[PDB]
Design a protein around this ligand. Structure first.
Ligand code: NI
Length: 286
């Protein structure tokens, strides 16, 4: 499978992407968008979307500025920490030199709208906003950012009230945001259960996204209409798919495309993640 990639190997191969002006590179761009991002890249724009975003820092720390329950808050995500952002939280990622982060998000439904907002200084007053149907976030954000920097609102620093929406196209999240957690420490604290053959959800049932940890054991994967990204963190496994068996060695990842039947056999001491973002599991509100 051309979708089996060693994560650190792929980062090394693409190392020049993780600095300005490029900063980011998509590993997979299908129903799941699996992307890696470097820095430095600091910014004042807040992204808003109807799906969730998974963040994991492979190298170095970042700061995700969020608007949480009507206030500005900085979420520091340190090297080795994983964090899940719920739907419809405005967020502004700040990245530093010589860092590498994973972000996972999903293809939007035809009905879902993305927004990009700038605020007046550190206040909750909106300065400028643009809403759009997101097909390729990076491609589409460049012209929007250029529009802001060319705008009267940027020139004056003052909102033009008639240039704002009376209300967003959907309610912004009113959820509190979780504390990032050490992935290694979480896996260590749950290791007996994992290796006893009980896969565990990292974040639980109140999110759309499921990030699930697995130890030794076997699984069957049914043909779903969403992608699944597997990451074999430690140890090895074998995936049976398309009439072939393929091994995942330590640090291999595999995107299993929507529509694929598969089986998965994980060896002693092995630890893996799966990531799914199924829009059918979207939270109706909140
Ligand atoms: Ni985002």
């Amino acid at each position: 499978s051309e979708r089996r990639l060693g994560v650190r190997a792929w980062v090394k191969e693409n190392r020049g992407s993780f600095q300005p002006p490029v900063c980011n590179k998509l590993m997979h761009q299908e129903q799941l968008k699996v992307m890696f991002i470097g820095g430095p890249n600091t910014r004042k724009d807040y992204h808003i979307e109807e799906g969730e975003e998974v963040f994991y820092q492979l190298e170095g720390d970042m700061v995700l500025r969020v608007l949480e329950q009507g206030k500005h808050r900085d979420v520091v995500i340190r090297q080795g920490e994983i964090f899940l952002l719920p739907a419809r939280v405005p967020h502004s990622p700040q990245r530093f030199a010589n860092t590498v982060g994973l972000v996972v998000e999903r293809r939007r439904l035809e009905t879902e709208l993305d927004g990009l907002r700038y605020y007046v200084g550190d206040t909750m007053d909106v300065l400028f906003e643009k809403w759009f149907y997101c097909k390729d976030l990076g491609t589409q954000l460049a012209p929007i950012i250029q529009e802001f920097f060319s705008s009267e609102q940027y020139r004056t620093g003052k909102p033009i009230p008639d240039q704002l929406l009376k209300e967003p196209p959907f309610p912004l999240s009113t959820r509190s945001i979780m504390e990032p957690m050490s992935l290694d420490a979480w896996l260590d604290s749950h290791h007996r259960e994992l290796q006893a053959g009980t896969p565990l959800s990292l974040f639980g049932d109140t999110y759309e996204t499921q990030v699930i940890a697995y130890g030794q054991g076997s699984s069957e994967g049914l043909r779903q209409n969403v992608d699944v990204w597997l990451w074999q963190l430690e140890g090895s496994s074998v995936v049976t798919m398309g009439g072939r068996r393929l091994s995942l060695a330590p640090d291999d990842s595999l995107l299993v495309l929507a529509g694929t039947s598969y089986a998965w056999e994980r060896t002693q001491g092995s630890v893996a993640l799966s990531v799914t973002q199924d829009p059918a599991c979207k939270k109706p509100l909140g």
